[PDB]
Each structure stands twice: as C-alpha cells, then as structure tokens.
Design a protein around this ligand. Sequence first.
Ligand SMILES: O=c1ccc2ncc(=O)n3c2n1C[C@H]3CN1CCC(NCc2cc3c(cn2)OCCC3)CC1
Lengths: 511, 511, 381, 381
Amino acid sequence: ITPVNIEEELKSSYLDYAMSVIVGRALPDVRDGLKPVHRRVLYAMNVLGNDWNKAYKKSARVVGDVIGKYHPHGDSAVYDTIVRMAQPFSLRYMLVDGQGNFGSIDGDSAAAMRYTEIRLAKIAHELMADLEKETVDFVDNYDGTEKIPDVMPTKIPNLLVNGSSGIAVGMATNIPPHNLTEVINGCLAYIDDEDISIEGLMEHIPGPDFPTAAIINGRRGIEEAYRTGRGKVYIRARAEVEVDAKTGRETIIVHEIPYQVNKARLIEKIAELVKEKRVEGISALRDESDKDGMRIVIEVKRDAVGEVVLNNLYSQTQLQVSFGINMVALHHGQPKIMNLKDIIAAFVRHRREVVTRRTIFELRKARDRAHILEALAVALANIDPIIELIRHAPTPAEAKTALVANPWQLGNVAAAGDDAARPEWLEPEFGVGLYYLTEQQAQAILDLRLQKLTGLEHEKLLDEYKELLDQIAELLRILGSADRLMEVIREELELVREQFGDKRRTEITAN
Amino acid sequence: ITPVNIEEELKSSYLDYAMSVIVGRALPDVRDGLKPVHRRVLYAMNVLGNDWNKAYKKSARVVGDVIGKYHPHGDSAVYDTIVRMAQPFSLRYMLVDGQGNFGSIDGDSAAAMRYTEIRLAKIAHELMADLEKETVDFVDNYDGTEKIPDVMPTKIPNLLVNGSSGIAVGMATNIPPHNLTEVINGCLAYIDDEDISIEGLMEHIPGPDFPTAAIINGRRGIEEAYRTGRGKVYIRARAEVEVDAKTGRETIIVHEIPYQVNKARLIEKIAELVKEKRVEGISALRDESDKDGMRIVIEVKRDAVGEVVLNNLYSQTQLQVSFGINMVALHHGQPKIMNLKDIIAAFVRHRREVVTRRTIFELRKARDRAHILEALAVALANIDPIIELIRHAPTPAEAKTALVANPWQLGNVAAAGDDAARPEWLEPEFGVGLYYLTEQQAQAILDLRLQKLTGLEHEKLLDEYKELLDQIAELLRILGSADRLMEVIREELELVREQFGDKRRTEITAN
Amino acid sequence: GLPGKLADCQERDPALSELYLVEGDSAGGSAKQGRNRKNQAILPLKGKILNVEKARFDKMLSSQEVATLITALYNPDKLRYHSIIIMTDADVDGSHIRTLLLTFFYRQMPEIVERGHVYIAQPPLYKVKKGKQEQYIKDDEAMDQYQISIALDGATLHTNASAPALAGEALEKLVSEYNATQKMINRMERRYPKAMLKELIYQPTLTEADLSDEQTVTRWVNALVSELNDKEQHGSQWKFDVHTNAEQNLFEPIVRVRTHGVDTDYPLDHEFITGGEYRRICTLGEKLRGLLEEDAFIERGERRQPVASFEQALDWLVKESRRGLSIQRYKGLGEMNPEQLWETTMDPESRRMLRVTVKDAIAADQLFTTLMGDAVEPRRA
Amino acid sequence: GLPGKLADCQERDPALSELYLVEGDSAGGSAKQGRNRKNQAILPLKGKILNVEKARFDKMLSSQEVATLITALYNPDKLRYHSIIIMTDADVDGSHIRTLLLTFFYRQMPEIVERGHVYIAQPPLYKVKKGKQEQYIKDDEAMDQYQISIALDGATLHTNASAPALAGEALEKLVSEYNATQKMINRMERRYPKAMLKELIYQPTLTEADLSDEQTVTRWVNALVSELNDKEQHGSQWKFDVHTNAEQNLFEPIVRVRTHGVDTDYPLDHEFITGGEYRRICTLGEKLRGLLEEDAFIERGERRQPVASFEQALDWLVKESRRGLSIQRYKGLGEMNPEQLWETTMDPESRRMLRVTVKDAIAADQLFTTLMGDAVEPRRA
DNA sequence: GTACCTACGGCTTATGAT
DNA sequence: GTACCTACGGCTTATGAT
DNA sequence: ATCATAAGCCGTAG
DNA sequence: ATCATAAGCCGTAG
Ligand SMILES: O=c1ccc2ncc(=O)n3c2n1C[C@H]3CN1CCC(NCc2cc3c(cn2)OCCC3)CC1
C-alpha cells in the first residue's frame, strides 16, 4: 500500500516545526518574562517543597524530577539553564541560591551535577505567591496526566528587570536589564495617570542597568529604542591614568569590564596585539585581581602620554562593544514589537485580573465555612434531644434522615448581614425561630467530638463567626469598589519596593 | 607548621582502602546474596511506591532519587546495574520488569536513561515482605540523616538462585545459578533432618541451571565444588548433523550457545578461522535466527563426514568453555569459603529470627490495641454521668483530671484470659466492679465521635475484642512452641514453591 | 564508513533490498533487533546535518557516509539500494530533520528523486487499550473520530419531540456538525467574546428586515442581556445600547460589557449579519431550537440521566466513555518493543509507506534560506 | 602538555613556586578561581593512573604530562618547582590514588623524595555550626572530643555521695574512661554476648579465691541470672550451670542462655579470670560501685533530671547537647566555596602540610603487587 | 548528538624461547 | 574519569576584491 | 582607497 | 619437541 504523495509535503512539515518553536521554545511572554523551561523548573521546585529557609538539596533530585514529569528534552539543557540562574554576574537579581563551583568570569565551566546544592531565594516566593488559590489556568502535560500553570501570578515585572535573549526561526529578541525601584516608580506614575507620555516615563526611568557597572555614552540610542523598539547603545569600561608622586612612570588601572566579556580571551588578545606591534606604547602586562575586586594593571611604555594609547584601545579593544536592543515578545501567542507603555499596561491588567480572581476564591471559601459553622452552632444549641434521637436510632443513615426530617427550635441564646451569609447554590427553602438542615450539615453534626462541650468552644465559635462576617463584608466591598482595588495594588507595590529596593550600579554620562 | 612524618604512611592508607572495599562493595552476603547497590535500589523503589500492578515510570526519577539520598557514586554504575537486572538472558529470575530497548545477546547496548520504563516484578515483593514491622536493623546514610535496612527480610535464598561474580582487592567469587523447586526441596529435607549428609543433599539437587540451556559433561567438577568450594565445569553447546532425505548435503544446526558468549564475535571468529584455513570442511556460513528461536546454519564442505569437523570446533571454538566455580561470601563481615550446608543453615537461622521478631511486634501491637479498646468500651458503658461531668467541667484538662480521679461502676452488661490482655509497662494499680483509668485512656475517651452511639458499634467492638483475644492467644502459643514455628516455616516454603515453581532448562549428561 | 554502522542484508542484488535512516543509538538498536535478516539494511545517524544552501562548499564534508554507502556520487553507473525509506520520530524535530534530508536529496541527486526511489514512513501515534480491545491510532483526526465512536456506542435518546427514541446516524451526524461548529467558534473566538457566541445558540433568530421596528431590536437585546446576566457566575456584568447610524434608521444593536476594570462595546453591522459564520450559527441555532430537547433521556448503556443542556448531556456521555480507557503515546522510536516496531512499521503486508514526486520547478527551496522569505512566509493569520 | 591544563604563576624562579595535583574538572575550577596569582600552580588530572610495577614498560606512556612539566626525566639538571603538594579527597578512592602517586614518585625519582620536596595536604573533614559558633573539624577523634566537650559544658551532678556537687575535670575523666571501656567492650563483643558484659558493670567483684565455697559461686551466678532474666525485655531467657573440672574443685561457673531456637554455653576459666580485659572491667565496676550514683541530679544547664542509670543520664545529656547543632561534611573538594578552600587549605599562615621521609630500604612496594602478599597481608584480626 | 583510558583476579589463548 | 559536531538570527570583526 | 566575503558568540535543542 | 611470557574479557569503580 503506497499512495502517491506530492512533493509539497516539505512545506507542511517545516511550517509545523517553525510554528511550534516560535510559540513554545524561545520567545518569552510579556506577562511574566519567563521561558517555559524556567517556568517548569520553578513549578517543580515549589511542588517538591524546597523553600529558602530549609536545608539544601542535591541537583540530581531536581533534574531527574523535571525530566521525569514535565520537561522531556534531555538533561544538559536543563542543567545549563539552572546553572545560568545561579551566577551573580549574569542576572541582576538571581533566583536560584546555590552552593558550589558555579564557574566565574574566567570562562571556567561549573562542576558536575553531582556536587552542587540549590534552593530557592527569598525573591523567588514573590514570583509564585498565591498559586493554589485558583488564580490561573492549568494545562496538561505531554501525556495528559498532570497539570501545569500557564502563567505565574507574579508581583514583579520580570520582563523589564532581567530580560532575555532568544533566537527563533524567523525572529530574534534582546532586552537589557533595569533597576527595580525605578520600574516600581514608573508603575506608580502610570497608575496615577493613564495617559502619561513617553517623556514622562523616561523621566522616572533614566536608563538600563547591568550586573557589573560600566559607562554609557549615547542617549539617542536608548531613546529611539524605548520609543520605537530598535536601537543601538555603546558600553565603555572604566579606567584611568596613574602617575606616582615621585619619578615612577605612567600606569593604567582597569576596575570593571563590559557586559559578557571573557577576561582570559581579552588578556590573550591584548598580548597578541602588542606582539603584532599593531598597537604602540605597551611594555608588559600584569594582574592583581583578588577577592576584593578585579584589578588589571598595564605598564605604559616610557615617554608616552598613554591617553592616545587608551583611545586606540577603546577603538580596537573589546573594552568598547555595542549592543543590539530589540524588543520582541508574545502578546496573545503572536510576536509583536512592543514598546514600554504596552508592557506596563499588560502588567497592570494581569495584576488586576489576578487580584479579582483571588478575591472571588477567598469569598467563596469563607462563605462555605460560615455556612457549616452556622449549622454546627445550631446543633450545639439543642443537645439533649439530639442525644436521645441518636440513642434511639439504630442506623446512622436513619439518624441523619431523622435529623433532616424534623424542624428545630433555635433557642434564644442561639440568635448578621441582610444576605451574603449563604452560598449561591443554596436554595431558598433552608434557613427560613424556624430552621432546617441539609445532608451536609447533618454529616458535619454527626462528625463532632466531645471536646466541643466546654465553656471555651462556644466563645471560640462565636468569635470565628463574627470574624468571618467582617471578612466577607470587606471582600464584598472590595469587589464592589474599584478605587479600593487600586489602593490595594498601590499598597502592595509600595511594600514590594520597600522590601527589595537597592542602589544603582552603572552610570550614564551623556556624551 | 610541617610536622615530620614517616614514609610508613603508605601502609595505613592502602589497608584502609582494601578493608573498606572488601566489606562494602564487591562481595555479597550469605543471608540474602545481594550487593549493597542492589539493596539500596530496591529500597528506594519500595519507598517511592512503585509496585508491579501500577503504571510504569521513567528511569530518570529512580536514578536521580538513588543518587540523591542513598548511593553517592555517580550515575553510570547505577544505571548499568539497573539495566543488568532487566535482561532475561542474564538472570534466571529477573527482578526489574522493564519496557524498552534493553540490548540483546548481539552485544548491543541499551538505550539512554531517558527512554526506558521500569517497575518491580511480582517476585520482588517476596524479597521485601514484612519490612515495616521492625524485623531488621536500620543504618544511617552517608550524612546521618536517613535510615537504611541492613539485610532484607527475604523469603527466597537468592544467593543460590542467582549468585554473583565480584573481584575485590584480595579475593574473588563466582557462583552458578540453580533451580528454585530443587532448592526448596533441599531446604525441606534439611528442616526434617539436621544431620543430613552431602550425598543426601546432592540427591535432591542434581546440578546447576542457566538462563539459556546447554549441556554439561563432568560430574567430578560440580561434586568437588559442592563438597570443598572450588572446582571446574565444562559447558557444551547443543548441535547435530542433518542430511536431507534426497541427495542434498550434510548440514549443521546450532540451537543454543553457552553462557555469556557474544554471537557476533563468535561468527566473526569462525569466519576468520575458515579464512585462515586452520579449520577444514567449512564452505560458507549463514543465519536464520528470528523471533521463534536462535538458529545458525553451517554448510559442510562436500565429501566430509563433518563429525571430525564438529569435534575440531568443540576443541577450538568458543562452543566449549570452562567455568571457575569458587564460593566466597561474607558470614559476619569476613570472607570465608563456605559450602552448601553452611549456606542452608544460615538461611534457616535468618528465617527463624525474622519470624520471631515479627511475631513479637504483632503481639505488642495487638496488646496496645486491646488495651485502648477496653477503656473505650468501659466509657461506652456509662455515658450519662460522663456527659454531665463534661458539661460542668470548664477546662478540658480539668475534665480529664476529674475522669482520672474517680473510680467507675462497670455495669453488668459491660462484663477474658487470666492475663496477657494488658501491656508490660502497665502497673498493677489499674484495672483491679472496680476499675480505674489512665491519661491515655481518658484522651481516647475524649476523642470519641457521635457515630459510636448506634446499635452497631457495640457489637462491632465486642467482635473486635474477641478477635484480638483469639489472636493474642495464638501468638503466645506460637512463641511458646517451637514445633509450631517449624510448621509455619514449612507451610510458607511450600506455598512459595507452589506459587513460583517451573521446569528445568539445562541438562546434565554424565560423560 | 562501510564498517562501524552499516548492517547490510544477505542479498547482494540491488532492486530488492531496503534501506532505512533513523537516529543512531536509541532507535538503531531496536531496529536491528527487530528487523529481518534477508533484505533489510539500517544506517544510523548522528544528531543533525548541515544545510546544502545555507552553507555550500564542495569541500565542506563531515560524515559523507550516506553518499559513500549509497553510490559513488555519476549516479547512473552504481545504483545499489533501489529503494530507500526514511523513518523519523513524530515530534517537531523529526519533521525538521526530515525537511533537511529531503532538501539534501533534492539538491544533490535529482534523478534518484525523479525515478521514484525515496519513501516516507508513517509510524503510529496512539496506542489505546480498553481491556481486551486494543487499537493502533496514527493521526489526530483518527483519534478524534475514535473517541466520538466510543462515546456514541449505540446510545438512545428519549426527548418529547416527534421521535420517541431519537438515536442512530442522525444523532451521530448532529453531534459531528455540532463539534465542527464548536471548533469554528473556538477558532473565531480570537475576535469576539465567547458568552454572546455561546448564547446565540439558544437565542432567537435575526434578520435584516428587523431594522424597521425599534421595539423588536429592543426586546431582542433585552432578552440577550438578561440571559447573559443570569448565566454570569463570574465577576462581570452586561449592558445594552441602541444606536442609529443612518439617514433614517439602519438600526444597529450594541452590547456594553463591563469586565474587571474597563468596558468594551461590540456593535453589529450589515457585514456581521451577512457573514457566513453568523449564517452557519443561525442555521445551527434554528436546527437546535427545532428539537425541543428539554426533557431528554439518553442511555449508554446501563444508565440514563435527564438534563436541560444538550452540551451537558454530551459532556456526561464523554465522561462515561472516558472513565476507564487507557492510552499510550509513543514519543520516540526507541521506546517500543522490537516486535511491535516490526509489526507496525516494517511488515511488507501491514506497513503504509508514502511516495514522493517531482511535480514542478519552483523556488520554495530558494525562499527556504534568505531570511526575507523566512520573515514573510509566516502569514498564518 | 604545557598548554591545555597547566596554569603557572607570574614568578619564573624555581624554589619559590608551589604546585598542586587534584582531580581535574570538578576540583580544578574551584582551585583556579580561589588560588593566588603570584606563586601558585595547578595541574589537573584525569581519573586514575597505571601502576609502575604491575605493568612496567618504558614504552608504556599515555599522559606523561607530569614528567614533561616537572623535569626532563637526568633530574639534577632541571629542578623547576622545588615544592610540590598533593591535594586529594578524603574518601577511600582518594587514599588509593594517593598511594598510586606515591609509589610512582618513589620508583621513578628517588632523589626528589630524598631531598624533601613532596608534601601532603590535610583538608578539613567536618564543618560544625551552632548558631554563631562555627568550627572546622578534620579528624574523627577530634570530632569525638568536640562532641564530648559540647556535652560536658560545665555540668554539675548532685548525688548522695561524699561530694555534694560532683562536677568538673573528675567527671570529664570518668566519662572519658567509661567511653574507652565501652569502645573496648564493643570491640570484644565479637567473641561473647553483650548482656553479661554489660551486667558485670553492676554485678559484684570476683576473685580466684572464691573457688573454695560452692555457695559463694552459686549465689553469684544466681544473682547474675536473676538480674539478666529481669532485664530481658526481648525474647530470650537465662539459666545457670555449676561444673567441677579438677581433682577436687577448681569451681567454674557456666551460663546457659536460650536464644530463638538453640542454647549456648559460656564457661569461665582461669585464663578468662586473669585476662587484662576482665581486670579492667572489674576495676571500672569497683570504681562505679564506689559512687552510690542512685539518687543523682545533674544540670546542663537550665534543667536537671534524676535517673537510676549513669549511662541513661549520659545519653540524656548527649541528646540535650545534640538537639540543635548543625554539621556539614565535605565529601569532595569540588563542593566548597573558593574562599573557604583558600582559607582552609592554601593559606601560607593557616594551612597544615605534611612532609615525607626515606627511612629505610624495604620490600613493602614489592609485597604491593604479587597477589601473595596481597592474600596474606590482610591479617587484621 | 556520540568513544576511549585506567584498577582488580582468574580463566583462556596466542607466541616465541630453549 | 573526561570533548567535540550540528541548527537557529543578529550583532560584530577580519580579509581580500574592484 | 573603498566594497564584498568569510569567521565567532550569544541560548535551548540534538 | 616442550616450557616461560605476554595479551584479552568478565563487573563496580575512577
Ligand atoms: O557521548 C559521549 C561521547 C564521548 C564523550 N567523551 C567524554 C564525556 O564526558 N562524554 C562523552 N560523551 C558524553 C559525555 C558523558 N556523559 C554521559 C551521560 C551523562 N549524563 C549525566 C546525568 C544524567 C542524569 C543524571 C545525572 N547525570 O541524573 C538524573 C537523570 C539523568 C553526562 C556525561
């Protein structure tokens, strides 16, 4: 059986591959700025129960679990992704606090996956806060046996804080990091005014930030990038001349190198350039870097101003490198070039939706709790007839049915809001003193203990009931009024800022 | 600070390495015939909860868990050990039922550890039966944070069923497999008579067994091996001549090869021998092996009897290979050359000890259960005064103290063995009708529910109490009488035999 | 090249042997252990292969084992293995490496493609086992039809319509048309909300002639908004709007919905009314309202339950069908048993191969790699 | 050889630089990232190394980087790196590779060993952190003494003996002697059961002169068996036996114990009575009976509890001490931070090296590999 | 995605020496 | 115990051609 | 003197 | 013609 097939089959397969990759592998999302791999790793670490205030764990457990349940694509990629997050010099705010040889700027790779130890950091629990309260949707795994959160209910706009860099079949993205307090201030400003201009936002956010400080020259590049979505920016290292108070000679000190530069490759290339005589005025080369800060010393050839040498280096050496800012991410499962205002608006909308859903969930939970507690109190009111009715009833099911069948007296000491103290699916034929029960209520009553018969539990139940009434009233009010929701979001953002603020590292000297 | 050290330091370090290896890595134990790696793997699979009647699981989970908690020695060794057990053609009774490319006799290695699926087999749960009832001791892990069973409470003498082969610093061991029913029959015979001779045991156990059948020639070797501990044995493949009813020509058929022989290497070596003209009468070589049994066809050169060729092959070809039987194992943490009778005696002693400890544990458990149930029934007897005493008592602790303080009436309907219905640590001042309580009993009484007040729970409690009395009486009797213990062991062995018997594979033709 | 990986067969005459190409270590073991030893051959591979166009150098060569084993690379002289087949995984990387191999063959040897020697395999995709009932399923639509057939195992509905016991091929076709319409609605959901699209199932009909009376439009939109606010169990509301954008009337309804913090309108125009999607929706709505499916009784097969929603009854039936089934999905050739691999892929009586053609001379392989065709071709909108 | 792995220092003059040897990929990264860049050097290694004796061939060479980098292999001419150090893990494989390297050096270049250039490092073994209190512990006996000191943080016992408040160095020495005796008993346990060895702590004394009266021996063994049957909480019993193996008396007690299924006797002889182990046991028993430690009161430091057993009080004190401590054990050099590695191993002020000597010319390296010395030397019994 | 080095004993098989 | 090949886009840097 | 062509690296994957 | 010497492979480890 060999049915003839046209050659056009090539187009259908390749298009499928491209459409799968672009959606599922490289490009991050605007709502949280997380690739699916990072998502699944964080979810696995949370499900396993590895918080920050606990003992460390071996990498093998986490890697094996991730390969087993959620991400069936080998091990090397997953382990490299984990090692990447732990390095301080590669992320402005690390997520996976580790312990062991994680490599360094010298280009040395990390140790094997059977030596290191990892656990979450304090900032990590802020990403996955309120996960169990039904705030997002769940998606099936590869075989349809588990559930995976679609988007994390975040509290921090990670996309602008860290950014990422991926290369798809047709598109490619690149985003610089930023500072946290400035992003929070910009979000506050946009919450105050919906129609803020790009100039206003640029006033609150001067420019990017890097894990290692540097110097930035051009203002046109970052402005064009924030306004349109494309632009270029230059990065310049920090150095200066030195002359001893006495005869001595002139010497250059380098304190910090640009972003993502191998130091050993740099030293070797400089040695090669000096050997090739392409550069002038360099005699030797040494190193003094230690555990107190990086320090490179270059000895200037005698009778040379050295500043022309420094300019020639800046022209030819890796000490000055460009950077291809290009903002591309997914908005509804489709790549779209998006500027700053769009990102901020998306973040705000996501936060609103999460807050609303969490509020609804907590309201329903408190409603059901109060509904059970009411019947429990009513049962506690009349005890002796229920005692006799149970003692006479041969069958527990028959006792439940008898409890359901008869009304109840509702003593005076037993006896809130006009409504909203009862669930939605409850029918108006219950709770019309006069009072009736339900099968669920009767089972709850039968599931009592004897410790509930002292002069403490009565007051405890009354207090719990009053507290639940107050809470459900507050929740109904916060659902009703949108200004209250805005105030809540503002307070949460201010708290996050006060908790996790810090100072600037880089510096922007305009031309 | 450099203190002078003698050169003799070499002896102390090497001796430590040898003493560690010999005890912990290679040599198995006489009590279960299991290397520590197999032990830890089985224990991890049991703790994870992967039984035989459940769905499969990925190898990555198990490997990562074993590396993480119990066996910190990399991954390749562990995965190779797991793959070794799954192969049918390498163990007489496999333990790890798997699914995927596990290699074959052609020498092809198994697939990566991210494709296969594994789970325990039905015979595996017989190795680890009654593990939680405190039958063996627990040893700390490498960091002192977990517990590991020392020896498995087995029901099968695995050492004689499968055997192993390891190479230590000074010693080396090798043991052939056997058949199950014959070992069980020998154990029964030794249980009947303590002073059986080697000739008697040799009558019940003719000889070894292999996963793939073969032919064995020498009886002297296996006899000397069973009697002393050392000996040699020959293995001969099965083949025959074939002549068609008509003219045709003579042809050789091979059905099965000896133990542990690569088929591809064999074919290549035979082709080389034919090419070198060292052997005569061979024209060509073909293959017909399929999914219905291995089949190798060799075309005899015309005008050759071929039997001289067959004898020359048996002399030179791998079709006849020797085997170095050498029985060495650990008896109390020390290597000792041990014969058959010693192994059987050790197995019987281990089984006796396990049975006794399990019986003691179950006795104590039933004792405590009955002790609680007695007080619960006594409380159920008098209900109304306890109701009033709880209703008046403000504090639950004060109510407990009041319940402890006063004696009780012990109504006539409320009212076994002369003794043994009460725990050991219980003092004679309780239960002198007259009756007193305990803090534990009072907490149990306070931990009652209302469902215990129907005309069903009374009879259920009475039935449970009678059953527990009968059970504790039976346990005391089985602890008292050793003939009962022997009968129990005999019945268990007969049941195991009837469950897991099978037929012979190999065959022994004496010279 | 010739040793190491290639494992030929007993026969040496070409035009009768078969050759395969797979991922090396994982799949080749099972392939060798399950194949035939008469007229079968296997050539494993390592990872991926460089493009012919993106990097073109007659000196650029790393493996070359393919050419070395197939011919001398020219081709009419030596013609061994007149039949070649490409087995590849069912993931996306499988299709990727498939496309790479196909463009390699096309841009290297056009004659071997023209003379019909390349073939494509079709591995199964799903293994469904319901106790004794096993099933090999290879396609998504096949799996869908199988699930539908299992859910529709001869059920019999009892409404109060003209049919005392509605059942059979009529019900099957009705459920199929409903599923097609639901898929179409889910596809168009990207444009408009889902509440209105789902409620127009039960809402009455509509016609361009209704733009005369304002009261008809008002009653229609009021009923719609009232039923929406009734069915709204989440945190949202619904409001109506009547607008006149014409010289005299051209009445056009407008719906005002208030989600979390911002309202959004959705006007109705002549183009929306005339759209074939809305036409199909109205046809299905009329067909479903002509049913009177309120008091219903369908059993499959030992239990029946009356509900008030056709889709809820369908969901209950699907749940009853999917209670106790088992499905295994093979996500790699190095995962199944060798005998299963044989029986499902390389049995000259049970396999289902696929042949390639040379239809035209086109520039698809040119737009392949210029980055401009790459940027423009994804117009799947 | 010279490139690839070796990372020398700035200084080129020998007799001032340091060289190290470790396992390559895991440890070398941390070593490089934590070392100094003035007079330090690192040479990673791969796996294990072949023996010099078991396989001797001047042509047999695989790495040779050690020789190539150290000298020209002859040695008086080039003498670079006058100081070499061997860092190695604390496991058993560490000691194994250490022995291999040492025998290599010895059988290749005797002069470099004679002139005192080889050194051995001593990495720490335990990291104990009690809140603020940190501690680096390198040895098992050091860890034991540390645990003892933590458990004995100035406690004060109150018995009814001659000392109103027994405490201090006397109690420390008593606990130390008790621990030594318990270790000796655990070592000798391989011979005799443990119940009798533990009960002779509190049982009265004994003397060879007691073989005169049969009643003295009878009373002694009766008290012993009665206390054993009292303390027996497991499934066992105890029975006595009186035997006369002499011309007249030479009375010798015999104990009959019944375990699970088989009884076992344990006679008492003149050699057992005179044994120094039994003598130490009797001395300790007399010292402990001269205490009257029944009504006791020891506090450490905010709680005290009276018990009836000195060992039970000791166990309670150990438990109270070990309630809330933290211990990290480094089982590999590629596990700690680079700064910690620096401070604990390669600080010219804090490190603790070790020097090797050339004492005699012996055949230890000959008995190394002949399989006969290998079979005979493990006489650790 | 994939190949090639070492230890440890006891068996053999191949090969050149006396 | 450990090293070296491939895809995918966008940036650069080096190098020889016109 | 000015332009076309060949490389290397960044992160998930094989 | 008969004996001493050098190899290869089996399974947990590096
Ligand atoms: O394929 C090759 C070919 C040659 C080669 N040379 C050196 C080398 O180091 N390697 C070479 N290779 C490859 C690599 C060895 N590779 C084997 C697989 C291993 N897998 C690591 C692992 C996986 C898992 C673990 C732990 N570790 O636990 C969880 C479950 C999965 C990593 C090292």
